[PDB]
Each structure stands twice: as structure tokens, then as C-alpha cells.
Design a protein around this ligand. Structure first.
Ligand SMILES: Nc1ncnc2c1ncn2[C@@H]1O[C@H](COP(=O)(O)OP(=O)(O)O)[C@@H](O)[C@H]1O
Ligand SMILES: [Mg+2]
Ligand SMILES: [Zn+2]
Ligand SMILES: [Zn+2]
Ligand SMILES: [Zn+2]
Ligand SMILES: [Zn+2]
Ligand SMILES: [Zn+2]
Ligand SMILES: [Zn+2]
Ligand SMILES: [Zn+2]
Ligand SMILES: [Zn+2]
Lengths: 794, 142, 361, 72, 99, 120
């Protein structure tokens, strides 16, 4: 945004917008002023003309027998070409052009400007009505082939319109990219499940036999029974989970609040959920204000409350899905980046397990739209034998089971009035996902000292161990951290598909190719984009990750790694090679460009070398969509590794969000730790005989937690004291703080714990009779018990 | 051994008996949920079998059709939620209107609190006097 | 909730399950109750039944406080305290209550059936708290017996107020009176719904009976009528709580020289003025209820309220008053029943006029 | 001061809810809006005026008796 | 051994005793929440004691309550019910309602 | 789960030899087992020695060896006879009152319904 003069000139030259348009601030942002999309719309026809003229030119070249390569810098903005300097001759009618670089570099601009809108009109004319498609049509394969041949004629690779015929995940991505491009033309009502009326013991039923994805094409179930007498338990379950009967038996619904695609309602009215405020706890407030707290000017106050929510808020929160947009990705560098990221996860193990080996925690919780009326997950877990689960798992490896996802409002404490939402997921999805992924998830969680730090506790010195491991041999180390504005609500679905692909790479022997594809299809049908029961009606989720699933964290971690790696690749390759330092890096860049756009298959040794280079000059510590980076600074001075401007550009062209740089933080020192990570501020103090890093939390959140609670849970702390014990454990590192207010907070907590305990003892000893023979409760008011939580031995 | 082995047998028998009582309870609950399954399934389906569904299924090439059209053609009752008066102005003006290439007749207009509202009350001046997730159910006029 | 010992007046979390009103009993108090009488059911925070599936042990004499749960002897955990031991029953605050002595009479009242005057006189000699408990349990017993009345079914519906009725075989037929309102239901296969409450009266003969119609139906031959229930509510305050009286100008400003002929009960008027509460027994027909007005207009500014248990009696008394009392009088008597009529002068509820009258209930 | 204003606003909204004020959709919406506004205030004047406006809601309805509970 | 077993039983009895006591406390508190909150609110109100606050509190205690939400802008209307005349001289003098 | 056809007492056992699977309480089930060749009894778990390769099904020879029905060959060191004390162990082992009309039930459970006496 600091230097976009060429783009402004181009926009004002071709009547895209008037020059006055650049006065209103944030014209370049997507979330702010989403009208920018209507500006980039008036460039699509130019791009389409350029593509047509490129096809003409390539045809003429191959007729006249010329050999050469084409690059974007030759074509003007009207399609005409020039600069034939490096073309050679051959026998006529045998010349071949090479255009992979051209197309691959051009790809992300196509959907950004929406080039292919003119294909939906009557005769490819903007001054004409729309093609009135037949309602029952659901195949469209021939139109896919027509479009791909008309615009991408000389792309030398096999393209299957239906990804079920591909040979490997590489082919899956290569075909799904084009599918994402094309299917923005066809009507929206022809996507989703495929129903078929069947008869069981002379009864009409509406079931689902397949799905028609926006990017995988058409998938048909293998084993489908038309006629039957009586149903078993598993079939009952899969039919009740399906949205088919609920959708058909319902009534037509038109919703004018949101802009998403409605489907139907189920009742004859609409619910209106609200979030009631919290409960106050006076006696703690009095005890706190007595010890000289909450005075004017003191550097501590309340910034954490229980905000109240009115009626129509669930819909106005669901409306934030409108920020999800279809987007192509450069297939070449995407394949390279996924290869490197696969190279990252080479220290774990996954595989299919049986129902006996499974582990389930907290079974007494909910289970979806169907099934939330009758018990909890424990009921269905016990009611089914092990063979039932084995058969259900084997069935999903050969079919597709769409489900419904319930929406709900959260009840907690934060610092802003924006609502929150959890998502209830059906139960069959849970059993299948657990049986499929559990081994790899445990392997990831248990391992210590890796790029991903999920499953590592901050107590007993773990925080210091992590902060040392990220601090590797960095010549001029610095610390940089960034943020993803609306990560879940704006995730492009191509990356989500690729992430679910990476996790499945470990299933080399446990599963076949077709089984792997069916599992991927099930995952896309169940978690990625499917029917979200909000309020009392049904809707359709355009995309973005859910929250009630079991693999959101790992998926987000893989996505973050991919973002960082592709930003590094982009940063390196946009630097003039004539002013580079010692040969090594310049040779590496040359090799990179070759292995990226000229080589067709994979090259392992260069992957290892680049991975080692990244480890040498880029260290990442990764949580779910939260990361801290230690990078060499002299390299970044010349733009040979990542930097915040690179992240801004990558996000702008790959996620359709403008990450303002005021949100990031950059640290030059390494004595003090990261400025913030997982809502913890890192401090370096003397413990024992040396210096260690301790994570200390913000005080205001702790005080707000102490004051405002729900009812009876802490309306009188005498009933349950372990709350104030647990709160104090996280407040102890406030003692070593240079400013003394935080130590005062810790002391106040100790005093209150002591008072609560003694007054409870008095209450039960006086009005009741017997409590006391041994105390054993001294430990809960001395720092000796607390500081054992950070001693590096347990 | 007469005062240790007998108690061991007592304990193992008692814990086994509690376990198999729990198992019997599990079987009973399984049967109850199975009955709920089949009764729900059989009672929901008996309110959809319009012959229009058979019509449109027969017109299909093999039978399979997109789900997003079944309530778009065979469903008999349409509910419309209107944010404000201006949207209501050019969406459902008059006692009847058309949508999805069919005619619909207005039957009953409720508000957020499920209080029936007369069509006269819906005016530009009277607008700041009603809860405004208006719900307007309607019939398939023909 | 937690209550208080019905004898020791200290807190309590136990009640006698086999007794009717379930008052709160001190631990030693309830131990005496259970060991000296037939109730073997005590209601603590939870009931006391052997938690073994298939067992039916409800007596408290064979319960052992096992691990977090009591069981029968066939299911008692080995390491288990007995429940009702040490001459007392386990419970809350156990070692802080005192214990009492009026257990025999208390449980006799708990088990007396009031078929003889013996327990009627015994009720008017015990603790005022126990007196109120006895009154409550007596009223509850009487109301429970009211359920013994049978069920009435229509034989045929002839006209507006002509009907034939069949009672149930072997049931005690309730009397037919105005003050007896009976609810009626209809049945179908799904519609077991109320049809209305009606009262009945005998017609000119046979089985011909008359009634009144609250709910307007076309009464078919498939109707029946049962008694309408009316529960009872606990009480808190005693009967005749005294706080003594003074002659230190605690009286109000009375009249000076008015009433003419009834200017006669004067010296007693201020005596009541200097008395917390008193009584005046009188033969029938003598000068009571004229005093209902002599002291009434003697202290005209005071808020003096009368209320009799009989509608006819209170109506006659208020009509007398109407002859000679502050005529801005309202008698807020009858709620929305109006079964038997009353005065025809003023409204139903004012709660502001000084000389309002009503029904005790 | 301001902290006490925030706490008493929380209490006032809590007590308003359980009296079935949320049946009136617009009334409950206005109350929620006012409550969330005060919890982000900066000076005492706006908090005081918004809170007196909020308390007018409770004062208009006669569900709770004023003088009886004003035993001081 | 008997001493060990009896002290074990005593401590388990105390454990059940205290846990059921806490259970009863929770039950009674959540049963009595209804009026405790009102007393709570009035204690905070009579502690804070702002001029306009206590002013309208007394105005309601005498029986002068409004019908609409009190507006804060110079414009917008407010309807207040005054069931007597003394309050008129108190607040409603001429046309200057000082509320 | 239900009342036994000979005692009306709540049981959970059915004779495996009888085709009709009749409910029998511990006392009456034991009587029917010892009164005929009804050595097969069905309950929550089929009264068969669930040992690898074992085939014994009679309740008399079966022993409660741990969490598994066991004969003597496949028993662990600790075992417990099910068919004992005139009432096989099972649901509600206390409240099994026993029956008087046992032999008629046995003859009913064993007659081929060929002689006129069977129909009598
Ligand atoms: N001061 C009086 N002068 C003349 N007659 C009186 C006087 N006081 C009472 N009576 C007559 O005596 C009767 C007393 O009866 P009443 O006042 O009804 O008392 P009670 O209710 O006990 O019958 C009245 O009917 C009234 O006519
Ligand atoms: Mg050129
Ligand atoms: Zn392919
Ligand atoms: Zn597998
Ligand atoms: Zn009793
Ligand atoms: Zn007592
Ligand atoms: Zn028992
Ligand atoms: Zn048999
Ligand atoms: Zn039996
Ligand atoms: Zn064996």
C-alpha cells in the first residue's frame, strides 16, 4: 500500500474507477470496503482477450514450425506479441511452444478479476441474458472439457474432469485446481448430495448415493441397496445421519437476512438464542478493594467481562462466511511447497487401527443434529459392539456420508463484544476420524523438540526448553511474529484439501489408492463444506475450517508452515542476481527456478538442500495459527529470506485478506523473550543458580476471572476453593516482576485463600462438630509449594 | 484360607455381577434407541409423497437428482424472513406474489414474539413499532 | 432445603418418611421416634433404600453406611458404619443437637386416627408448635379421607337440567350439595381432556337430577364426574401470641359522647384499648354484635376488621354494622367463587377501607 | 467510581433478565446495547446517563417494590 | 488393626458428612438466588449514591415512575406519571421538569 | 429378563434344551436342569465354557473361573460352580422361591406329543 502507483495508473487509465476513488481510505482492503471486488471485475474481459490471442499465436507458431518459449513481459495489454529474437526453425507443422511458466504465473489473477464471467452468458456476450440451464442436470463434464480445450489448449498434461480417475495426489491437486476455476460458471443449485428414491419392504425412502463437489467432480457410491426387507443398526444410523429426509420433509425457506444459500427449514418457526450476562462475586471485590486496589492511575484494571448478546446474533455471526471466496493457486510452486512441507513431517508414524486400540476422553458430551435428543456420545459408544465400528469404518472407505453440523453460542469471558460460536459435529464422523487418525495424532503430541509444539507443557521448565530450541545457531538473530486476520472464516479450500492430503501421506501400506480417495472425499463432505443447522433451519457452508472437529489444530499448523515456506520462496526469487553475495546463494536460486518451472517430476536432493538451508537461516516454533520466528537479520536485509512485507503480499494474493503490519511485532533483542505467544509475556529472571525464562500472564484477565463468574460455581468460594488454588498457580510468576503491583496481586490471592480456608474451618467446627485431626492445608499459603511448578525436575 | 479365599470369591462374583447388570442396562438402552430410530424414520416420511416428486424423479435420466431442488419444486409451504420494511416493500407486496417460478399466497404473518400482525399494520410510518425478524409463511398458490 | 428439629428447635435435615407431613426431627429425636413407633422411613437429603438393584430394603434398622452408599446386609460393603447406632441416627451436625423428651406423645399424635375424643383433647394440651402440627396433620387426614368418595357417571342426558346418574359399585357415595364442585372428563383414544366443573342437585324424583353449566358443552352420555381436590398449606405463626399491654396512653383517640343508648359499654372500650387481646363470652341473642358496632363507632378512625367463618353469619353481622357504622364501608368478602351469595352493597376487593369483612379461608 | 459503575451495571442487567424482560424483543435489545456500551465507557458522565436510562427500564415496570426493599 | 479400621471409618464418615453438607449448601443457595440478587442490587445502589440516581430512586419510592426509557439527547420525548401534586411543586414547576 | 414360567419370579435364564426358551428362576432352573437332560441354559451369556477349543455346555460341570465360564480342564486356580445350592447363580439369586409343578413341566418339555396322554 506504500507503493502502488502502477496499479493506480492502470486502474484509472482503462476506466476501472475514477481517480477520486483513492481518497477514501482502505480502498485496497477486502474486509473494509468490499466494493474493491467490483473494481477488479472490470478487468476480466481484457484477460480473456489476452488468453484467446495467446491461443491463436501458439497455433500459428506450431503451424509454421517455430520453437521457443513465451513470457508475460512480451505481451502488451491488448494481446499482441513481439520480440521473436530467440526463436529457431524446424520442419513446418512440427514446431512446439512451451507455456508452463506463462500460465502458472498468470493463474492467481484469473479468479481475482473473475475473467470467466462471460462464459455464463447466452453467447459469450456481456450484453445478453444468462444460459437457462436445466434444473435436473448434474454432470457438466463436457462443458468442463470444452472450456479447458478452448482456453488451455497447449497445457501439456492430462486433466481428468473427475478426480476419481487420477493416479496420485499430485494429479489430484493438478486437476482440482482447474476444477476450482471452472465450476464458478455453473449454477449453484446443482452442487451437493445426490438422492435416489429406494424401496424397503414396500416403503418409499429418499437416501443419498453420491456427491457433486465443487472441485472433485462426481463421486458415486459403490455398494447401494435398492430393495431390502429390514434394516440393521448401522444402516439405520447412516440413514438417520443423512440430510436427505430432513431436507425433503421440510418446507421451502427463503432467508433475506444473510446472503448464503439457504436450503430449507424444519419447524414452523425460528429460534432466537441469547447469551445472558455473568454473575458477580462481591466478597472478593471487597477483599480486593480493602488492600488498596482499583485506585485511579494504577496500572491495573478490568478488561475482561461477560458481554451480553441480544436476539438475532447467531445469524449475523454466520454472515461472516461471506469473506470466503474461490481462489486458484499457482500449481507449480504449490506442488513444490507441499513437497517441502511433507519433508518436514518425517519423524512420526500413522496407520489404521482397530476399535479396541482406540482411546476416547470425556464421553459424556454431545453428538450432532440427529442424536442430540437421546443421551450423549457414551450411549452410542457402548450400544455398538467392536464389529459394528469395524464395519462402519470399512463402509466409509467405499462410500460418502454427508452429515449436519449444529451451531451454538459460547459462554465465556473476553475483551470485545464480538460473539463466539462452537460447532457440534455428528457422531459417525467422530468414530471414523478417530479410528483413521488417532495413531498419528498421538505420535505428534508425544514427540518433544520439533517444529510443532502441540502437547508440550509450559510447567517444569518446558517453556524454557522450547525457547532455547527455537534459539538455534542464528548469526544475527531477531524475533518476528505475525497474525492471520480471520484465519478460519477466510481459509481458501485448496490449502485445506492439501493439508488433509499431507496427513494421509503416512497411510502408505494400511490403505489402497481408492480407499485413500474415498477417505479424503468423506473428510471434505463432512468437515470442509456441508450443511450447517443454524437457528432452526439448514444452510450451506461455503468453506473455511470448522471448530468442533478433532484435527483443526494440526490442519492449521500445516497451513501455517505452508504459508511461511511459500513466502520464503517468493521472497528469494524476486531479487536481481547481478548484485548477489557469494556464489552459493545465486547458484541455489538458479537451481530453484529450474526445479520449479522447468523440471517436471520431483528432485529430492535439492529438496533436502533447501530444507537444510531453511533450518540454517529460519527457525519456526509452530502452534495452531500462532508462531514465533527467529531469523538471521543480515540475510533479511538483502531480501534473501522472509520479511513482514513478504507476508503481507502472500496473504493479499493467496487469502484475500489485508494483514495490516501494525499487528505484527519485531524484536531485535534476545535477552527478553518473544513479546507475546499464547497470551503469555516472557520474562527472564534468576531462579536457583542461573537465569531462566518464565511465562507470566496479563493480570487484568486474572482479576476479571476472580471477580465475575457464573452462579454458585464461585458465587461463594467457600464451597469450592480449588478455583483460587488453580488461579494462583498461574499468577505466581507475577512475583518476579520489576513493577510491584503484580506481586501485590499474588499476595492478595494468598491472603484470600487463607481467609477462605480458615472461615470454612470455623463454620464447620462451630455450627457442626468435627473436622480437624491433621491440617495438611498449610501448603496452600506459602510460595514453596507454588515454585515447585517451575523447578526443572518432576 | 477359609477366611481369605471365600472373600476373594465374594469380591470377584460381586464385581462381575455389577458388570453384567450394567451390560443388561446397556442392552435395554440399545433397544430403546433402536425403537426411537425406526419410529422416527417411519413417521417422518408419511408427509412428503406428493406425486410431483414421482413426476420429477421420472423425468430424470436415471433417478439421481440434486438435493437442493426437491424442496424447490415439491415443497408446499414457503417461509420468508424479512430484515426490515424496505426489503418487504419490493419482495412480498400484495396478498400474493411469485417466486421460484410459481405463485404463492400469503397466509398468516407473525413477528419475533410470535404475535399475529395484520397486513394493514405493515406501513412505512408504523414500521418502528414491531419486532423485525418478520416471518411470512405462505402456500403454493395455483 | 434444610429445616429445624420439631422438638429441639435446632436445625435439621431429616424428616419422618412414613409420617404424613414430614416434619424435621432431631437426630436423637428421630431415633426415639423410629425406635418407639412403626415408621422406619426417614427422609434425609436422599431417601434410605438399599441401592442394590433388585433389593427392596426400606427400614433404617438394617442399613449400614457403606462407601458413599448404604446397602442391605446382602450388599453392605465390609468397611461400613451402621446408620442408626449409639442410641441415635446419623445425620448432619450430629454432635451439636441436644435431644428432647416429648417423643411418646408426639408419635402418638403422629399415629392417632382421631376416631375417639382421646386424641382430640390430647391435641389441645401439647406444644403450640406441636399443636399447629397436629392441626395440620388432622386437616390433611380429613382431606385424604375425602378422596374415598366414589365416581359418578351419567346414565342418559335428557334435557337442560334433567339427568340420570350411576355411581360406582361399592363406593361411598358423596352427598349432593352446592358446596361440592365436581370436574368432568371425556375420553376418546387421545382426547382425555377436561369438559368442565359442575355442581349437581336432585330433580323432582327418581334419578332425575339438575345441575349448572360452567363450561358450555352438548353434554353426551359418555361423561363422568369426580371430586375436585383442594390441598393444604403449612402455617408459621401461633394462635394467640401475646405482647402484653399498657395504660400509658397506648390507646387511640376515641369518641367523646356519642351512641346515645349504646353509650354504655364505655368502661370496657378503653379497657380493650389498654389490653392486647381479650374476649367476651355471651349467650345467644344477647348484647354481642352491637358491640361489633359500639366499639366500632367508639373508635371510628381505627381500622377495625371482622371476618366470620360462616357466609350467612358474616353477612348478617355486616348488615347489622350497615345499620349503624362508618358507611364508607366496603366488605371485600367473596373471591371468584360466588357459590353462595352474600351482601349486595360493595365491591369484591378494596383492601383500603377500615371496616372490610371477608371469609376466613 | 467507574469500576463500581461497571459492576452495578452488571448486577442491574443480571436482575433484569430473570424477570422475563427478554420476551420484549426490542426492550431486551436496547438493554443489551446500553449494557455493552457502558462496559467500554471512558468518563463518568456518559456511564451515568446511560445507566440512569437503563434503570428507567426497571423503574417503569412494577414487578419489584421500591419503598419496601428501600429499608435502608 | 481395629484402631486403624475405626479411624478409617471415622474419616470416611466425616468425608461423606462434609460433602453432603456442601451439597445442601449449594441447593439452598441456588434456591434462594431470587431475592438475594435484589438485595445485592439495592446494596450497591445505596452504596454508590449518585445525585440523579438517588433522586429518581426517591421519586419512584413516592410513586412517580416513567413509562418509556429516559432519553439522553436534548430531543426525544419522555412520559412520566405523577400521581400527586406535591411532586409537581418538587419537580414540575412552570414548564421546567427537573428530573 | 422376566418372570419364570414356573415361579412367576423375576429371572433372566432360559433353558437351552427347550426350543421355546422358557424363563426360569435359579431354583426352578436348577430343578429343570436336574430333572431332565436340560443341561443347556441360556442367560446374559450362554452357559458354555468359553475356553479355546472347549465344548462342555452343562451348567453342572461349569465353574465360574474368573470372568469366564470354565470346566475343570480349562479352569484357572480360582473357580466357582454355577449349578450349585439348588439354584444356579444369576440375576436375583436371593428371591428365587422355587416351584411345585416341576415334573409336569419336564414331561411337557420332553414329550413328543404322540401318545394321547401328552394331549391329556
Ligand atoms: N342499646 C340497645 N337498645 C335497644 N335494643 C338493643 C340495644 N342493644 C341491642 N339491642 C337489641 O338486642 C339484640 C342483641 O342481639 P345482637 O346485637 O344481634 O347480638 P347477638 O348477635 O348475640 O344476637 C339486637 O337484636 C337489638 O335489637
Ligand atoms: Mg513483448
Ligand atoms: Zn487427474
Ligand atoms: Zn488407512
Ligand atoms: Zn413417623
Ligand atoms: Zn431433637
Ligand atoms: Zn439389598
Ligand atoms: Zn428346558
Ligand atoms: Zn422360578
Ligand atoms: Zn473348558
Amino acid at each position: 500500500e506504500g507503493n502502488c502507483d502502477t496499479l493506480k495508473e492502470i486502474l484509472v487509465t482503462y476506466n476501472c474507477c475514477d481517480d477520486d476513488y483513492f481518497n477514501k481510505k482502505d480502498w485496497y482492503d477486502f474486509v473494509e470496503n468490499p466494493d474493491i471486488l467490483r473494481v477488479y471485475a472490470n478487468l476480466g474481459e481484457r484477460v480473456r482477450q489476452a488468453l484467446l490471442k495467446t491461443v491463436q499465436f501458439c497455433d500459428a507458431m506450431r503451424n509454421a514450425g517455430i520453437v521457443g518459449v513465451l513470457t508475460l513481459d512480451n505481451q502488451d495489454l491488448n494481446g499482441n506479441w513481439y520480440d521473436f529474437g530467440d526463436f529457431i526453425q524446424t520442419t513446418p507443422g512440427s514446431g512446439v511452444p512451451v507455456v508452463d511458466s506463462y500460465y502458472s504465473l498468470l493463474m492467481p489473477i484469473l479468479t481475482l478479476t473473475r475473467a470467466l464471467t462471460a462464459e455464463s452468458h447466452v453467447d459469450t456476450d456481456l450484453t445478453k441474458p444468462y444460459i437457462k440451464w436445466d434444473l435436473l442436470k448434474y454432470d457438466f463434464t463436457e462443458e468442463r472439457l470444452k472450456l479447458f480445450d478452448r482456453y488451455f489448449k497447449y497445457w501439456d498434461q492430462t486433466y481428468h474432469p473427475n478426480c476419481v480417475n487420477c493416479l496420485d495426489d499430485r494429479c489430484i491437486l493438478h486437476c482440482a485446481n482447474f476444477n476450482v476455476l471452472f465450476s464458478t460458471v455453473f449454477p449453484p443449485t446443482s452442487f451437493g448430495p445426490l438422492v435416489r428414491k429406494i424401496f424397503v419392504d414396500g416403503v418409499p425412502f429418499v437416501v443419498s448415493t453420491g456427491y457433486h463437489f465443487r472441485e472433485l467432480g462426481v463421486v458415486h457410491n459403490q455398494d447401494v441397496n435398492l430393495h431390502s426387507s429390514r434394516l440393521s443398526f448401522k444402516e439405520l444410523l447412516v440413514y438417520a445421519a443423512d440430510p436427505a429426509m430432513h431436507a425433503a420433509s421440510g418446507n421451502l425457506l427463503l432467508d433475506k437476512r444473510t446472503t448464503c444459500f439457504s436450503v430449507a427449514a424444519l419447524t414452523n418457526n425460528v429460534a432466537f438464542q441469547t447469551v445472558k450476562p455473568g454473575n458477580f462475586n462481591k466478597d472478593f471485590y471487597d477483599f480486593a478493594v480493602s488492600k488498596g486496589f482499583f485506585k485511579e492511575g494504577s496500572s491495573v484494571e478490568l478488561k475482561h467481562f461477560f458481554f451480553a448478546q441480544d436476539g438475532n446474533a447467531a445469524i449475523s455471526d454466520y454472515d461472516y462466511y461471506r469473506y470466503n471466496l474461490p481462489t486458484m493457486c499457482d500449481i507449480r510452486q504449490l506442488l513444490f511447497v507441499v513437497e517441502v512441507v511433507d519433508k518436514y513431517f518425517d519423524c512420526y508414524d500413522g496407520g489404521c487401527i482397530n476399535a479396541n486400540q482406540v482411546i476416547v476422553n470425556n464421553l459424556d458430551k454431545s453428538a450432532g443434529f440427529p442424536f442430540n435428543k437421546w443421551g450423549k456420545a457414551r450411549l452410542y459408544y457402548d450400544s455398538m459392539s467392536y464389529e459394528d465400528q469395524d464395519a462402519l469404518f470399512a463402509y466409509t472407505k467405499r462410500n460418502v456420508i454427508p452429515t449436519i453440523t449444529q451451531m451454538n453460542l459460547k459462554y465465556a469471558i473476553s475483551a470485545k463484544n464480538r460473539a463466539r460460536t462452537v460447532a457440534g459435529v455428528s457422531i459417525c464422523s467422530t468414530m471414523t476420524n478417530r479410528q483413521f487418525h488417532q495413531k498419528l495424532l498421538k505420535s505428534i503430541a508425544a514427540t518433544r523438540g520439533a517444529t510443532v509444539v502441540i502437547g508440550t507443557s509450559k510447567f517444569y521448565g518446558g517453556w524454557h526448553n522450547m525457547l532455547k530450541t527455537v534459539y538455534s545457531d542464528v548469526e544475527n538473530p531477531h524475533l518476528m511474529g505475525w497474525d492471520y486476520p480471520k484465519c478460519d472464516r477466510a481459509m481458501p479450500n485448496m490449502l485445506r484439501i492439501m493439508a488433509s492430503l499431507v496427513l494421509a501421506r503416512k497411510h502408505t501400506t494400511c490403505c489402497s489408492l481408492s480407499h485413500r480417495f474415498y477417505r479424503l472425499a468423506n473428510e471434505c463432505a463432512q468437515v470442509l463444506s456441508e450443511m450447517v443447522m443454524c437457528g432452526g433451519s439448514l444452510y450451506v457452508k461455503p468453506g473455511g475450517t470448522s471448530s468442533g472437529d478433532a484435527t483443526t489444530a494440526y490442519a492449521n499448523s500445516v497451513f501455517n508452515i505452508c504459508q511461511a515456506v511459500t513466502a520464503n520462496v517468493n521472497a528469494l526469487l524476486s531479487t536481481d542476481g547481478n548484485k548477489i553475495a557469494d556464489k552459493y546463494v545465486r547458484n541455489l536460486q538458479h537451481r530453484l527456478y529450474e526445479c520449479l518451472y522447468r523440471n517436471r517430476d520431483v528432485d529430492t536432493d535439492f529438496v533436502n538442500e533447501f530444507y537444510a538451508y531453511l533450518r540454517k537461516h529460519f527457525s519456526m516454533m509452530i502452534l495452531s495459527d500462532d508462531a514465533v520466528v527467529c531469523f538471521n537479520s543480515t540475510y533479511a536485509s538483502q531480501g534473501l529470506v522472509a520479511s513482514i512485507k513478504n507476508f503481507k503480499s502472500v496473504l493479499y494474493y493467496q487469502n484475500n485478506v489485508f494483514m495490516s503490519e501494525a499487528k505484527c511485532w519485531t524484536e531485535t533483542d534476545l535477552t527478553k523473550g518473544p513479546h507475546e505467544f499464547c497470551s503469555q509475556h516472557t520474562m527472564l529472571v534468576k531462579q536457583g543458580d542461573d537465569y531462566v525464562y518464565l511465562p507470566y500472564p496479563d493480570p487484568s484477565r486474572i482479576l476479571g476471572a476472580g471477580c465475575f463468574v457464573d452462579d454458585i460455581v464461585k458465587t461463594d468460594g467457600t464451597l469450592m476453593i480449588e478455583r483460587f488454588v488453580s488461579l494462583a498457580i498461574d499468577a505466581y510468576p507475577l512475583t518476579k516482576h520489576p513493577n510491584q503491583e503484580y506481586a501485590d496481586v499474588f499476595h492478595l490471592y494468598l491472603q484470600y485463600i487463607r481467609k477462605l480456608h480458615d472461615e470454612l474451618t470455623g463454620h464447620m467446627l462451630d455450627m457442626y462438630s468435627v473436622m480437624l485431626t491433621n491440617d495438611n492445608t498449610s501448603r496452600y499459603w506459602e510460595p514453596e509449594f507454588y515454585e515447585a511448578m517451575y523447578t526443572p525436575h518432576t | 484360607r477359609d477366611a481369605a479365599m471365600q472373600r476373594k470369591l465374594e469380591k470377584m462374583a460381586d464385581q462381575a455381577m455389577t458388570q453384567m447388570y450394567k451390560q443388561a442396562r446397556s442392552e435395554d438402552k440399545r433397544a430403546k434407541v433402536t425403537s426411537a430410530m425406526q419410529t422416527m424414520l417411519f413417521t417422518m416420511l408419511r408427509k412428503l409423497d406428493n406425486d410431483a416428486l414421482n413426476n420429477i424423479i421420472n423425468n430424470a435420466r436415471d433417478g439421481c437428482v440434486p438435493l437442493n431442488i426437491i424442496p424447490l419444486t415439491t415443497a408446499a409451504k414457503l417461509m420468508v424472513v424479512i430484515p426490515d420494511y424496505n426489503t418487504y416493500k419490493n419482495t412480498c407486496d400484495g396478498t400474493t406474489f411469485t417466486y421460484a417460478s410459481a405463485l404463492w399466497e400469503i397466509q398468516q404473518v407473525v413477528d419475533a414474539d410470535s404475535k399475529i400482525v395484520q397486513l394493514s399494520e405493515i406501513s412505512m410510518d408504523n414500521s418502528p413499532n414491531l419486532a423485525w425478524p418478520l416471518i411470512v409463511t405462505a402456500l403454493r398458490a395455483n | 432445603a434444610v429445616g429445624a428439629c420439631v422438638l429441639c428447635n435446632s436445625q435439621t435435615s431429616l424428616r419422618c418418611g412414613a409420617c404424613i407431613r414430614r416434619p424435621f426431627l432431631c437426630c436423637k429425636c428421630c431415633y426415639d421416634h423410629v425406635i418407639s413407633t412403626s415408621h422406619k422411613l426417614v427422609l434425609s437429603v436422599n431417601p434410605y433404600v438399599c441401592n442394590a438393584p433388585g433389593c427392596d430394603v426400606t427400614d433404617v434398622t438394617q442399613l449400614y453406611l457403606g462407601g458413599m452408599s448404604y446397602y442391605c446386609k446382602s450388599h453392605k460393603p465390609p468397611i461400613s458404619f451402621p446408620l442408626c447406632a449409639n442410641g441415635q441416627v446419623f445425620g448432619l451436625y450430629k454432635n451439636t443437637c441436644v435431644g428432647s423428651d416429648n417423643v411418646t406423645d408426639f408419635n402418638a399424635i403422629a399415629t392417632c386416627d382421631w376416631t375417639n375424643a382421646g386424641d382430640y383433647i390430647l391435641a389441645n394440651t401439647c406444644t403450640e408448635r406441636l399443636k399447629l402440627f397436629a392441626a395440620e396433620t388432622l386437616k390433611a387426614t380429613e382431606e385424604t379421607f375425602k378422596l374415598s368418595y366414589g365416581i359418578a357417571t351419567v346414565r342418559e342426558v335428557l334435557s337442560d337440567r334433567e339427568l340420570h346418574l350411576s355411581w360406582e359399585v361399592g363406593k361411598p357415595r358423596p352427598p349432593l350439595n352446592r358446596n361440592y364442585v365436581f370436574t368432568g372428563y371425556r375420553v376418546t383414544k387421545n382426547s382425555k381432556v377436561q369438559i368442565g366443573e359442575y355442581t349437581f342437585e336432585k330433580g323432582d324424583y327418581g334419578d332425575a337430577v339438575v345441575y349448572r353449566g360452567t363450561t358450555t358443552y352438548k353434554l353426551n352420555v359418555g361423561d363422568y364426574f369426580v371430586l375436585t381436590s383442594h390441598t393444604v398449606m403449612p402455617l408459621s405463626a401461633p394462635t394467640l401470641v401475646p405482647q402484653e399491654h399498657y395504660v400509658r396512653i397506648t390507646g387511640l383517640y376515641p369518641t367523646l359522647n356519642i351512641s346515645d343508648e349504646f353509650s354504655s359499654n364505655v368502661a370496657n372500650y378503653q379497657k380493650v384499648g389498654m389490653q392486647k387481646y381479650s374476649t367476651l363470652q355471651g349467650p345467644p341473642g344477647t348484647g354481642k354484635s352491637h358491640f361489633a358496632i359500639g366499639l366500632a363507632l367508639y373508635y371510628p378512625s381505627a381500622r377495625i376488621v371482622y371476618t366470620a367463618c360462616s357466609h350467612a353469619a358474616v353477612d348478617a353481622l355486616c348488615e347489622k354494622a350497615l345499620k349503624y357504622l362508618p358507611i364508607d364501608k366496603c366488605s371485600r368478602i367473596i373471591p371468584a367463587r360466588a357459590r353462595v351469595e352474600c351482601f349486595d352493597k360493595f365491591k369484591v376487593n378494596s383492601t383500603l377501607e377500615q371496616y372490610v369483612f371477608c371469609t376466613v379461608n | 467510581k467507574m469500576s463500581d459503575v461497571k459492576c452495578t451495571s452488571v448486577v442491574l442487567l443480571s436482575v433484569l433478565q430473570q424477570l422475563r424482560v427478554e420476551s420484549s424483543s426490542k426492550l431486551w435489545a436496547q438493554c443489551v446495547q446500553l449494557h455493552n456500551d457502558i462496559l467500554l465507557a471512558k468518563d463518568t458522565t456518559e456511564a451515568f446517563e446511560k445507566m440512569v436510562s437503563l434503570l428507567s427500564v426497571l423503574l417503569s415496570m412494577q414487578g419489584a417494590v421500591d419503598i419496601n426493599k428501600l429499608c435502608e
